Design an enzyme around this catalytic site. Structure first.
Site, PDB file in Angstrom:
ATOM      1  N   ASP A   1       0.826  -1.206   0.000  1.00  0.00           N
ATOM      2  CA  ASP A   1       0.000   0.000   0.000  1.00  0.00           C
ATOM      3  C   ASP A   1       0.858   1.253   0.000  1.00  0.00           C
ATOM      4  O   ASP A   1       0.556   2.218  -0.695  1.00  0.00           O
ATOM      5  CB  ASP A   1      -0.933   0.026   1.214  1.00  0.00           C
ATOM      6  CG  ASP A   1      -2.074  -0.961   1.092  1.00  0.00           C
ATOM      7  OD1 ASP A   1      -1.815  -2.180   1.176  1.00  0.00           O
ATOM      8  OD2 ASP A   1      -3.229  -0.516   0.902  1.00  0.00           O
TER       9      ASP A   1
ATOM     10  N   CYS B   1      -1.244   1.239 -13.824  1.00  0.00           N
ATOM     11  CA  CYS B   1      -1.370   1.133 -12.372  1.00  0.00           C
ATOM     12  C   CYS B   1      -2.519   2.097 -12.108  1.00  0.00           C
ATOM     13  O   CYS B   1      -3.597   1.917 -12.677  1.00  0.00           O
ATOM     14  CB  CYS B   1      -0.083   1.545 -11.639  1.00  0.00           C
ATOM     15  SG  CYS B   1       0.837   2.941 -12.321  1.00  0.00           S
ATOM     16  N   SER B   2      -2.335   3.109 -11.273  1.00  0.00           N
ATOM     17  CA  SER B   2      -3.434   4.038 -11.085  1.00  0.00           C
ATOM     18  C   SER B   2      -3.233   5.187 -12.069  1.00  0.00           C
ATOM     19  O   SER B   2      -4.064   5.408 -12.957  1.00  0.00           O
ATOM     20  CB  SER B   2      -3.488   4.567  -9.654  1.00  0.00           C
ATOM     21  OG  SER B   2      -4.740   5.197  -9.425  1.00  0.00           O
ATOM     22  N   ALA B   3      -2.120   5.905 -11.927  1.00  0.00           N
ATOM     23  CA  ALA B   3      -1.817   7.020 -12.825  1.00  0.00           C
ATOM     24  C   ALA B   3      -1.094   6.523 -14.074  1.00  0.00           C
ATOM     25  O   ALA B   3      -1.021   7.232 -15.084  1.00  0.00           O
ATOM     26  CB  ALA B   3      -0.958   8.059 -12.110  1.00  0.00           C
ATOM     27  N   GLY B   4      -0.564   5.303 -14.001  1.00  0.00           N
ATOM     28  CA  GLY B   4       0.154   4.744 -15.129  1.00  0.00           C
ATOM     29  C   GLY B   4       1.472   5.453 -15.401  1.00  0.00           C
ATOM     30  O   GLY B   4       1.838   5.661 -16.563  1.00  0.00           O
ATOM     31  N   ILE B   5       2.188   5.834 -14.343  1.00  0.00           N
ATOM     32  CA  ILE B   5       3.474   6.508 -14.505  1.00  0.00           C
ATOM     33  C   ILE B   5       4.477   6.118 -13.418  1.00  0.00           C
ATOM     34  O   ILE B   5       5.690   6.121 -13.655  1.00  0.00           O
ATOM     35  CB  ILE B   5       3.313   8.057 -14.515  1.00  0.00           C
ATOM     36  CG1 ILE B   5       2.830   8.548 -13.153  1.00  0.00           C
ATOM     37  CG2 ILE B   5       2.338   8.470 -15.614  1.00  0.00           C
ATOM     38  CD1 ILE B   5       2.544  10.032 -13.106  1.00  0.00           C
ATOM     39  N   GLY B   6       3.970   5.782 -12.232  1.00  0.00           N
ATOM     40  CA  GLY B   6       4.838   5.392 -11.128  1.00  0.00           C
ATOM     41  C   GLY B   6       5.275   3.939 -11.184  1.00  0.00           C
ATOM     42  O   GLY B   6       6.393   3.636 -11.617  1.00  0.00           O
ATOM     43  N   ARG B   7       4.402   3.033 -10.742  1.00  0.00           N
ATOM     44  CA  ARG B   7       4.721   1.606 -10.766  1.00  0.00           C
ATOM     45  C   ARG B   7       4.914   1.144 -12.209  1.00  0.00           C
ATOM     46  O   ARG B   7       5.831   0.384 -12.506  1.00  0.00           O
ATOM     47  CB  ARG B   7       3.606   0.793 -10.101  1.00  0.00           C
ATOM     48  CG  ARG B   7       3.312   1.223  -8.659  1.00  0.00           C
ATOM     49  CD  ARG B   7       2.218   0.370  -8.037  1.00  0.00           C
ATOM     50  NE  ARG B   7       1.680   0.961  -6.818  1.00  0.00           N
ATOM     51  CZ  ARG B   7       0.606   0.502  -6.180  1.00  0.00           C
ATOM     52  NH1 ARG B   7      -0.042  -0.562  -6.649  1.00  0.00           N
ATOM     53  NH2 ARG B   7       0.165   1.115  -5.085  1.00  0.00           N
ATOM     54  N   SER B   8       4.047   1.610 -13.102  1.00  0.00           N
ATOM     55  CA  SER B   8       4.136   1.255 -14.513  1.00  0.00           C
ATOM     56  C   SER B   8       5.517   1.663 -15.044  1.00  0.00           C
ATOM     57  O   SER B   8       6.123   0.954 -15.854  1.00  0.00           O
ATOM     58  CB  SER B   8       3.042   1.975 -15.310  1.00  0.00           C
ATOM     59  OG  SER B   8       1.741   1.578 -14.902  1.00  0.00           O
TER      60      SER B   8
ATOM     61  N   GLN C   1       7.660   7.954  -9.753  1.00  0.00           N
ATOM     62  CA  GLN C   1       7.123   9.008  -8.904  1.00  0.00           C
ATOM     63  C   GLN C   1       7.827   9.379  -7.605  1.00  0.00           C
ATOM     64  O   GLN C   1       7.507  10.409  -7.019  1.00  0.00           O
ATOM     65  CB  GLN C   1       5.664   8.688  -8.591  1.00  0.00           C
ATOM     66  CG  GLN C   1       4.715   8.923  -9.744  1.00  0.00           C
ATOM     67  CD  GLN C   1       4.467  10.398  -9.983  1.00  0.00           C
ATOM     68  OE1 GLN C   1       3.928  11.094  -9.120  1.00  0.00           O
ATOM     69  NE2 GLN C   1       4.860  10.886 -11.154  1.00  0.00           N
TER      70      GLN C   1
END
Length: 282
Positions: A180, A214-221, A261
């Site tokens: 999380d 992912c959520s924003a598609g920039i951090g984990r992605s 991020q």
């Protein structure tokens, strides 16, 4: 070397400093289509938009907008489409893109609900007998099989273009154990997940670009795409120690803003590459 650099940064706890230099050097391009009033509901975040020059266009005369970017790594010979976790109203668009781009795999790095709130719409069917139909894009999606493992889940899906009655198999690779807060303690499972995606052929040239989100598609992605390319580059070059992750990341940021991020995510990327290099070769 990379690992040698890694240890230096920890020694002096410069992660925040280094990560910030990357941010300052990062490219900036216009996102006019993304900002049009008619597209307000197609964006999950007001501060996460695709650059106009590298955005994915839906093949419809009406509105061709979808918050997704094509990241083309010329040298690595690899492409990825990074997108935001779809919204209640963009699920049909999401699968329209998967169909039009001829994608083979969908990579999900988050859970539908995290920290008590929705981080992505339930865009795929959970039961074989309960298929989904996206009326706006005239698409049918059916869960064909599912394989739940400890750290990730792989689903076999059938996507049908109701207009032509043509069908395709789509592999859904869902990493289900991302914490999380923060990042994984060990890049181990993340790396196996990545290799599992590779092993399926979803990242190969005979198919369209893999869809990562992912959520924003920039951090984990970002973490996924950065790790994969670097590893791949260390396999091609005569001198594997020349692969500069910060350089690769900056190259990727020319196609989509904010990839990676936090300094924790940056450090984690180094870990995955360094650790992934040892197994891939030693």
């Amino acid at each position: 070397e990379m690992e040698k650099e890694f240890e230096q940064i920890d020694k002096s706890g410069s992660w925040a400093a280094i990560y910030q230099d990357i941010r300052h050097e990062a490219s900036d391009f216009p996102c006019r289509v993304a900002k049009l009033p008619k597209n307000k509901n197609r964006n999950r975040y007001r501060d996460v938009s695709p650059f106009d020059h590298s955005r994915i266009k839906l093949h419809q005369e009406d509105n061709d907008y979808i918050n997704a970017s094509l990241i083309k790594m010329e040298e690595a010979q690899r492409s990825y489409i990074l997108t935001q976790g779809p919204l209640p109203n963009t699920c049909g668009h999401f699968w329209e893109m998967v169909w039009e781009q001829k994608s083979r795999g969908v990579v999900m790095l988050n859970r539908v609900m995290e920290k008590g709130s929705l981080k992505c719409a339930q865009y795929w069917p959970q039961k074989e007998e309960k298929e989904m139909i996206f009326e706006d894009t005239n698409l049918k999606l059916t869960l064909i099989s599912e394989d739940i493992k400890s750290y990730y889940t792989v689903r076999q899906l059938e996507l049908e273009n109701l207009t032509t009655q043509e069908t395709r198999e789509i592999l859904h690779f869902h990493y289900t154990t991302w914490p999380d807060f923060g990042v994984p303690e060990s890049p181990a499972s993340f790396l196996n997940f990545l290799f599992k995606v590779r092993e399926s052929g979803s990242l190969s040239p005979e198919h369209g670009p893999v869809v990562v989100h992912c959520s924003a598609g920039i951090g984990r992605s970002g973490t996924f795409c950065l790790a994969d390319t670097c590893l791949l580059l260390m396999d091609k070059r005569k001198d594997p120690s020349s692969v500069d992750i910060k350089k690769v990341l900056l190259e990727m940021r020319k196609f989509r803003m904010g990839l990676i991020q936090t300094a924790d995510q940056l450090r984690f990327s180094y870990l995955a590459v360094i650790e992934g290099a040892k197994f891939i070769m030693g």
